[PDB]
Amino acid sequence: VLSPADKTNVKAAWGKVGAHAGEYGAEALERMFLSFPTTKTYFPHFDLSHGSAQVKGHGKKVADALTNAVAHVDDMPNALSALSDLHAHKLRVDPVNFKLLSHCLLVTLAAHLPAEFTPAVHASLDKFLASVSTVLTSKYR
Amino acid sequence: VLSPADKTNVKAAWGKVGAHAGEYGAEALERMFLSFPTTKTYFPHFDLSHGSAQVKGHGKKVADALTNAVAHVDDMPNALSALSDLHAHKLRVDPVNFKLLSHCLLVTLAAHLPAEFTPAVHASLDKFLASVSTVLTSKYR
Amino acid sequence: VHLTPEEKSAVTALWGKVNVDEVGGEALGRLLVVYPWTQRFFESFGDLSTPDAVMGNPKVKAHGKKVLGAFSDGLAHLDNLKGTFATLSELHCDKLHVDPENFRLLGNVLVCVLAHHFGKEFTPPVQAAYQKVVAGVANALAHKYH
Amino acid sequence: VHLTPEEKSAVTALWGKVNVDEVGGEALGRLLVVYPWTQRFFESFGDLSTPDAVMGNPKVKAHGKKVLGAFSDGLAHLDNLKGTFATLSELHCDKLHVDPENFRLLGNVLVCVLAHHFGKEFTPPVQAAYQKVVAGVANALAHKYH
Numbered sequence: 296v297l298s299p300a301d302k303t304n305v306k307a308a309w310g311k312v313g314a315h316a317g318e319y320g321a322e323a324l325e326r327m328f329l330s331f332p333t334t335k336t337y338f339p340h341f342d343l344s345h346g347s348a349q350v351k352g353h354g355k356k357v358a359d360a361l362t363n364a365v366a367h368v369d370d371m372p373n374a375l376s377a378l379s380d381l382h383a384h385k386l387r388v389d390p391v392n393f394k395l396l397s398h399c400l401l402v403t404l405a406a407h408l409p410a411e412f413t414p415a416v417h418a419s420l421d422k423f424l425a426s427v428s429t430v431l432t433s434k435y436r
Numbered sequence: 437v438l439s440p441a442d443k444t445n446v447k448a449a450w451g452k453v454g455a456h457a458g459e460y461g462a463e464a465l466e467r468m469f470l471s472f473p474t475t476k477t478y479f480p481h482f483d484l485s486h487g488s489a490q491v492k493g494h495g496k497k498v499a500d501a502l503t504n505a506v507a508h509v510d511d512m513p514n515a516l517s518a519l520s521d522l523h524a525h526k527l528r529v530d531p532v533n534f535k536l537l538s539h540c541l542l543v544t545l546a547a548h549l550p551a552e553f554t555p556a557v558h559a560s561l562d563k564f565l566a567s568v569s570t571v572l573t574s575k576y577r
Numbered sequence: 578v579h580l581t582p583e584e585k586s587a588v589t590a591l592w593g594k595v596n597v598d599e600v601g602g603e604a605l606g607r608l609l610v611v612y613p614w615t616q617r618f619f620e621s622f623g624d625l626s627t628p629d630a631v632m633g634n635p636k637v638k639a640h641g642k643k644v645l646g647a648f649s650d651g652l653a654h655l656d657n658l659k660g661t662f663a664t665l666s667e668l669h670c671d672k673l674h675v676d677p678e679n680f681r682l683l684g685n686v687l688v689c690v691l692a693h694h695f696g697k698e699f700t701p702p703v704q705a706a707y708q709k710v711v712a713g714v715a716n717a718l719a720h721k722y723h
Numbered sequence: 724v725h726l727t728p729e730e731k732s733a734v735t736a737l738w739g740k741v742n743v744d745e746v747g748g749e750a751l752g753r754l755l756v757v758y759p760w761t762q763r764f765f766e767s768f769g770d771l772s773t774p775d776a777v778m779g780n781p782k783v784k785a786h787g788k789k790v791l792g793a794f795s796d797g798l799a800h801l802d803n804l805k806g807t808f809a810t811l812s813e814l815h816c817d818k819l820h821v822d823p824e825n826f827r828l829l830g831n832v833l834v835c836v837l838a839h840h841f842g843k844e845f846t847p848p849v850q851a852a853y854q855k856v857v858a859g860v861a862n863a864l865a866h867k868y869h
């Protein structure tokens with residue numbers, strides 16, 4: 296359950312990130328693949344090397360999904376329903392991997408938001424990504 | 437997201453358990469305390485020895501909460517809201533501990549439902565307890 | 578992992594009654610049905626479309642047999658699980674990249690199968706002893722990640 | 724845990740720039756704010772009612788200092804984390820009964836603090852190397868449970 300304070304914090308961090316969100320998504324994916332190499336097996340057909348166009352394009356898709364979630368924060372199950380289906384049924388994404396990507400998304404924000412990433416905002420972002428993760432694992436099947 | 441099949445399976449298992457639910461809750465708590473001794477620190481004021489009246493009475497409370505959840509399966513966040521508050525805010529229950537109690541509840545059902553505990557019903561019960569757990573950790577704070 | 582003699586007694590007495598041709602396949606089938614992401618590593622097994630399809634799948638039973646063989650192995654070598662599981666760890670971690678959380682899950686599913694089969698005989702202390710065992714196995718199988 | 728020389732290089736070069744009087748308290752404060760169940764083990768610390776109260780709590784800073792001292796310790800002894808962390812493992816597991824999932828969490832929070840403080844310098848490979856480290860520490864601190 297995301298609080299009014301949490302929603303304002305996540306909105307503030309989104310704003311500061313601005314037009315870098317795609318690039319940051321790409322960075323978070325690289326951080327994940329290097330830090331948690333088990334995650335790589337989900338992208339056997341991607342080239343995962345640094346500067347990969349496929350990782351860049353995917354980063355944008357992920358960032359776009361998260362922003363759809365922020366923009367529909369009070370109706371996330373509905374907004375992310377198609378993605379929930381995809382990740383559970385087709386991709387069979389192991390639930391642990393959502394915590395790994397969530398951590399890498401936080402790390403990327405921390406590396407780029409010296410002023411914004413306070414203890415309170417870090418908390419709110421953690422809750423937001425945990426809420427997104429809960430939605431995206433809601434389907435198994 | 438609990439399916440129509442899941443809801444019927446959990447209802448069937450509830451029915452078979454019948455008036456033993458309190459006793460089974462007590463057993464699941466004993467299984468937890470012995471198997472996962474870290475959980476014991478949440479009950480410093482209980483006597484946790486076998487046949488403890490406090491563990492028996494608590495088992496009944498837990499079983500009763502789960503049955504309230506079954507009976508209001510389509511409105512669990514609301515039905516369990518007071519309990520969610522209690523477990524996150526006052527008790528500060530670590531989220532990992534919900535998986536430990538959930539596992540011990542399944543084990544207890546498996547030990548008492550030779551016919552009912554099929555692979556499908558085991559699945560549905562796992563999803564049910566995971567849904568309950570998700571509600572009861574929804575609050576931190 | 579250090580089991581006490583009472584814990585060792587609980588574990589070995591039960592295990593001698595386990596049907597080693599069946600229990601492994603039951604635990605594997607349940608793993609695939611309950612935690613269906615794990616079906617990712619078992620695409621070659623064929624029909625996994627329903628619980629019935631999984632539990633009656635001959636490849637599931639045959640492979641589960643090998644899995645239980647490895648648990649049986651750890652049970653004979655509790656004080657050296659790391660050595661016992663070295664080549665399986667290499668396999669599950671370096672080659673397959675299974676997240677080690679699933680090792681804990683398979684261990685817990687095994688516990689559920691044991692409870693289902695043994696009923697009241699699978700007492701709370703008997704479970705406790707088995708929990709130490711399956712945690713020890715999961716930790717050794719995960720050694721290549723540590 | 725085995726770090727490559729490149730991983731060792733990444734880790735030690737960064738750590739020499741860490742403010743050892745501050746970073747431990749920052750990581751501990753964030754642990755208490757983000758994962759507030761952990762406040763359960765720190766009731767004696769006093770006012771933990773808000774983020775500001777936590778981060779400015781003098782007991783949080785003082786205790787975080789000791790925690791970072793232990794990370795500093797593991798960094799000097801990567802190939803013997805088990806020995807380094809024996810008495811802390813006894814403490815955190817046998818006496819305190821902290822679930823070891825929280826060791827992983829504190830390690831990840833530390834990583835977040837390092838990223839916040841170092842910015843672009845905390846590159847994806849630098850993070851990777853730190854992940855191996857904090858996992859190694861968590862695993863050694865959890866040895867008493869294994």
Ligand code: HEM
Nearest residue numbers: 334337338356357360361386388392393396397427428431
């Ligand atoms: C914060 C959590 C996540 C978000 C917001 C997210 C978002 C997305 C989006 C937007 C797509 C493309 C949708 C489409 O084009 O149909 C996608 C696909 C995919 N996702 Fe995720 N995802 C998340 C977590 C994960 C995790 C944890 C994994 C595995 C480690 C994963 C693996 C994949 C894979 C393998 C694809 C297909 C990629 C391809 O073939 O091009 N996702 N995700």
Ligand code: HEM
Nearest residue numbers: 475478479497498501502527529533534537538568569572
């Ligand atoms: C399936 C999940 C759970 C259910 C349905 C459940 C249910 C309940 C209920 C009904 C109460 C009493 C409510 C009241 O009288 O106000 C309670 C209290 C409590 N619960 Fe849980 N709970 C669950 C998980 C947990 C876990 C995982 C822990 C910790 C390991 C825990 C620790 C406690 C404690 C320490 C109390 C206070 C007991 C006392 O002082 O008498 N609960 N729970």
Ligand code: HEM
Nearest residue numbers: 615618619643644647648665669673675679680683684718
């Ligand atoms: C509970 C711990 C586990 C044990 C004791 C175990 C045991 C085994 C054994 C004995 C084999 C046969 C190796 C051989 O043929 O030489 C095997 C293979 C395999 N395991 Fe496991 N396993 C465990 C967990 C898991 C999990 C959780 C997964 C996936 C969710 C998995 C995936 C596989 C796969 C895909 C193979 C086939 C490997 C191949 O032939 O290339 N294992 N395992």
Ligand code: HEM
Nearest residue numbers: 761764765789790793794811815819821825826829830864
């Ligand atoms: C990331 C791994 C951790 C490290 C390296 C670490 C390190 C330390 C150190 C160096 C001490 C001082 C021991 C002494 O005074 O001799 C300590 C004490 C303590 N730790 Fe941790 N710790 C970790 C994780 C945790 C977590 C996650 C919690 C709770 C959520 C926790 C709870 C405590 C408590 C309550 C004490 C006070 C013990 C006492 O004085 O009786 N620790 N820790």
Ligand SMILES: O=N[O-]
Nearest residue numbers: 324353354357396
């Ligand atoms: O990168 N997650 O789709």
Ligand SMILES: O=N[O-]
Nearest residue numbers: 465494495498537
């Ligand atoms: O026993 N859980 O309250």
Ligand SMILES: O=N[O-]
Nearest residue numbers: 605640641644683
């Ligand atoms: O349990 N699969 O090896």
Ligand SMILES: O=N[O-]
Nearest residue numbers: 751786787790829
């Ligand atoms: O981080 N507490 O020792």
